[PDB]
Design a protein around this ligand. Structure first.
Ligand SMILES: Cc1cn([C@H]2C[C@H](O)[C@@H](COP(=O)(O)OP(=O)(O)O)O2)c(=O)[nH]c1=O
Ligand SMILES: Cc1cn([C@H]2C[C@H](O)[C@@H](COP(=O)(O)OP(=O)(O)O)O2)c(=O)[nH]c1=O
Ligand SMILES: Cc1cn([C@H]2C[C@H](O)[C@@H](COP(=O)(O)OP(=O)(O)O)O2)c(=O)[nH]c1=O
Ligand SMILES: Cc1cn([C@H]2C[C@H](O)[C@@H](COP(=O)(O)OP(=O)(O)O)O2)c(=O)[nH]c1=O
Ligand SMILES: Cc1cn([C@H]2C[C@H](O)[C@@H](COP(=O)(O)OP(=O)(O)O)O2)c(=O)[nH]c1=O
Ligand SMILES: Cc1cn([C@H]2C[C@H](O)[C@@H](COP(=O)(O)OP(=O)(O)O)O2)c(=O)[nH]c1=O
Lengths: 243, 243, 243, 243, 243, 243
């Protein structure tokens, strides 16, 4: 047992992929570990995608990880436009001028390669269909075929479709070891499987500055509010706050 | 994807119909885009109609757009009287003298043609009935038949009648691409569907000078108070303020 | 629509019964129109009755209108005594001498006929009972039977009794077209239905010379203080001031 | 109505019990009428009791009225001593000599009969208990049993004890028709029920010669300062001034 | 009542302990009565202690009364030194020579006995602590145990410490019947409880000869300036003036 | 108490350091005692420094006391030059000749030793900084370290800097027992703490011969003008006058 414990001790990975932007989030969760399903939820328009996108950007950019992004609602172009702006600290969607200036400027193309030029980001859309298996097959391919380290499912709103999907999702993450982040719309109880299968659930709250609350973290058990973030309307990035 | 993003970038219309009178409203909303439902709400008598009417006047007059106006509460004559006065910077309803002077003067007729002479404004009343479909059928006709660019529904007060109507309205706007502005009476929470389906919600506040608050804007997400306006009791126009 | 607007324009009555004594009140309200409910409120003993009474005197006397007065609190004699004094610019209630002198003098009788001799004023009391319908039935009779142009309800203090009554009152005024003035005791918010149903609300303020404030006027929307009046302790008439 | 108004006119009592000592007090109040509650208030030691006492003396002495005096704070002897001195224009409480001289002189007894010998004054003390009903029962007896025309409650300082008492007091005065004068200690707003129920409120002010201010008079409405009085330190009587 | 008034008349003590040195002080106050709290106030160094001390000297010396003196600020020796000098019309504190001469002369001892030899004066110090009850306990002992007729508290400067103390002091004086004189430092309004609880307030004023003003006297009500006194820099006694 | 008073009597020091030059100053103040703060004030250039300097010279020279001098405005050399001249009855600052003659003459050096040769005078400058504590620390050192009997602070002009300083100064003097003389510039009321904390305040007045007025002396209380002095323009010494 002694030797059995030792190697067990020196082989266990407690700290996963560290999050970014919110001072305190890593304290209460120790980052994202493989095989775990992170659930990021809150009200519509409260900044879920942005936050996840930001995490994705840093993971694939700085942590040198491969990130696949599967969008159920919006298209790839839309997603691509968001990441590029984000990466370039500008909000392409808000400036008809910038969009026009950047294309003839040659900056678009320069921006496109400096981001997707490598094999780091894998965006997939067209899952508009409500079939789980068709979805799981694509996810499984993104992991095995594209070697994605992190897969973000965007998005799901609160039957068995969700119950069964959440159980299939958690099964996929646990068995492969990929980090699966899922974005769910909330219109703890505010979400069965949704709460049960998810390993860590993060929720963002706003004015009614965003409050990041850790509703649940199996591994650490440390719950509560991890900290606050401030959205920069000019850059579109969520920044750590001094609240 | 590259070419897919590019054309997506150069084909997206971020700035819609710009609003008028309030310095700052366009900053936080980037105007009104087609397929979106703008909700203008506040207390009764707080200036909702005026504001919308003003927007309508400029849109159909300066922006060269076709504006249909569907009134649930008041008659066409009443509406027509308001626009004409507005257009002529006078308050017909307040001056028994002016009304009388303008008819024998020949200015009424001159005013009537210089405004409705063209096929730009389409006023429809007699929706007094509480049936949605009868209403949707007329709206759909104003868009398709009369080619209206903007449709203002005046008005609605806070069941399914509203819930279902709001969902039918948003469905009509999204699918056709028309800009639908709806005026609702409030006697964010102050309004389900009302808040959910509406893309942008503007609220006016007064003394208890009008404060224009942007309760919600999906596209931009930029919320808060856009600015202030000053009502000119002599002209009836809401003017930009220096508060 | 053109012809439809025209006649609408030449048939609309913007200026109602003009008020008297306060230079500016008509400016911000354009007088009292039929079908509207005017609410005159303020602290007890602040001069509500006097003001209304004065308006009533001029309306029935100079404007050649029929005025019915329904008193909930005081008796007809009391009211009659007030009008007569008012009409004769003397305060009968304050002079035991004058009352005695005028009866044997023959001036009482001369005063009584020169005021009530005609079918212009209709005073009704004995509504001490808290039943609305009994009240509405009498009001409706004063309008239809006695052909009263203006009906003053004196008075009401701030449930449904008031809520339902105010809604019944406004319904009676709108449908018949009579001008209903109601006096309410206040011990804008200082008053639901009270504020909602009333078309114009006038409030008098004093020393803690009377300030006439127009809390609300649907038709005109022009709010604020209309002007000041000075009470003549010798005549009992409120006079226009030079404040 | 005519005959109804007439007799109403010739049966109404406008002028009540006239006050004494202050030229002008009767002008602004027309004296004290039955069924009304007069409130006399001011700072402690400012001369409230004296003033009331003086009124009481004249009422019961010259106006041939019966005056009951109920003291909450001080004893009957004390009150009796004050009235006697007052009646005899001397300050018994200030002269150890006079008190001694008057008893052996036989003047005390002569003074006692010439004042209380008749059934005009009724002094009651021992209400030290804070119970209202016990108090109302005694008051009611002073009116009905002793036939008191005027009842002076001395005194009360500023809950429901006061709120409920004031409402019980006003109810007692209105229903019986007695004139109830109440003395309250003030340490218009300076006093709910206190201001509301009281028909006339008189306040005395001094040096920081006494100024008599009429804070409120329902019947007349005439407010303001009625005049000034000068306290005679030798006689203890408040005299009319020439300020 | 008659017999009740009589004995009341012949048992009442209007004139208390007469003051000394200022012709007129007794006129406006009739001396100090038991159960009353006399407040002597003015600017620091204006002669408060001296005046009180002088009163104390005469009371215990000529009026044959027992006087207890409780000092909060200074020591007994200091007080004793003042009284002795005062009693001997010399200022011990000002003459290093006299102090030295009197001790070897044997006059000190002769002076000490001729003043404190009897059980007339009771000086207590060491109240430096800010606790009221500890103070009240000593005062109560000076009254009951030492049978002091007059107690002088020296001194207090202007919370609840003062508010509560003043209310405890007045309660002690009223219930026991002792005359409590309190010296307060002023750096009528110049002083709540201080003004309220005190029965008589005397103030001294100087050059910016001392003016003695009677700010308040419940019993007599006679206020104003009682007269003037002249300080004898050689004897230390305040003398009556001819101003 | 007897023995307690006696020793108190024979241990008290009434007469402090006697002043010089003005016949009468000691009469009204009995000199300067330890623990007291003497304030010498008047208009700029009216002779404050001279007077104090003179006192300092005599104290340290004839009374055999140690005098520390702390200058806020001028330098040590300047001060030293003044004392030396003063000591030698000549005005060094006025004679370019004398200054030159005395240095080569050897009289400077002889003068310097015959004055500062001993450890009697301690001059400190360089307090130009507006910090109190830095100042108090030096003062405390002059007392404890240098054993100064008298400390002259020169100078201060009329917040908390002065308020707090005066309270710190008085606290330092009372607790140590040193005599602290402070010179303040006046551009009784002419000066809170300044007047309050100071034990004795002396003021000099001139022609618009110097008049010495004792504005205040706690210990003695004797106020008024102590006498007059005549400035000798040739020696620089203020001399007693025969006015
Ligand atoms: C957090 C946040 C978002 N937003 C905007 C950006 C987007 O246009 C819009 C939606 O944000 P999004 O991240 O899509 O929210 P969610 O995923 O919860 O639906 O809101 C702001 O304008 N300000 C903010 O502070
Ligand atoms: C904003 C505003 C409105 N109004 C008047 C104009 C109209 O007669 C009346 C109603 O305005 P309206 O635009 O109808 O208000 P809403 O649509 O919120 O019910 O108020 C003013 O008089 N002053 C003002 O500043
Ligand atoms: C306005 C006013 C009223 N009054 C008097 C007249 C009446 O006797 C009494 C009540 O006035 P009233 O009109 O009855 O007041 P309201 O209707 O608000 O209760 O006040 C004055 O004496 N002076 C004034 O300036
Ligand atoms: C008005 C007045 C009262 N007083 C005295 C008489 C009484 O002893 C004392 C209290 O008067 P009082 O009438 O009791 O005052 P209140 O009822 O307001 O408490 O004051 C004067 O000495 N001078 C005056 O001018
Ligand atoms: C009244 C007076 C006091 N004094 C002195 C005597 C004391 O030493 C000092 C303080 O007097 P004191 O009685 O202590 O004043 P208070 O009690 O108001 O503080 O003042 C005079 O020198 N002259 C005077 O005319
Ligand atoms: C009193 C006095 C001063 N002085 C001069 C001496 C110095 O040069 C100057 C300033 O005196 P100083 O003592 O410094 O005055 P203060 O301290 O009040 O500012 O005035 C005279 O010339 N004649 C005089 O009579």
């Amino acid at each position: 047992m002694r030797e059995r414990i030792r190697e067990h001790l020196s082989s266990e990975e407690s700290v996963g992929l560290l999050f970014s932007g919110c001072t305190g989030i890593n304290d209460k969760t120790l980052g994202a570990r493989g095989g775990e399903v992170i659930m990021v939820t809150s009200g519509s328009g409260m900044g879920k995608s942005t936050f996840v996108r930001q995490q994705a950007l840093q993971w694939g950019t700085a942590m040198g990880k491969k990130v696949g992004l599967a969008m159920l609602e919006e298209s790839v172009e839309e997603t691509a436009e968001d990441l590029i702006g984000l990466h370039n600290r500008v909000r392409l969607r808000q400036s008809d001028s910038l969009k026009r200036e950047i294309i003839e400027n040659g900056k678009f193309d320069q921006w496109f390669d400096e981001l997707f030029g490598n094999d780091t980001f894998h965006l997939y859309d067209s899952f508009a269909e409500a079939e789980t298996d068709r979805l799981l097959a694509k996810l499984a391919y993104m992991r095995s075929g594209l070697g994605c380290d992190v897969i973000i499912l965007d998005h799901i709103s609160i039957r068995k479709m969700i119950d069964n999907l959440m159980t299939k999702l958690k099964g996929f993450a646990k068995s492969t070891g990929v980090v699966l982040v899922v974005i769910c719309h909330l219109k703890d109880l505010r979400g069965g499987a949704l709460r049960q299968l998810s390993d860590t659930i993060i929720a963002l709250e706003r004015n009614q500055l965003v409050l990041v609350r850790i509703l649940k973290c199996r591994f650490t058990g440390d719950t509560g509010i991890a900290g606050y973030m401030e959205y920069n309307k000019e850059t579109g990035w969520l920044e750590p706050s001094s609240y």
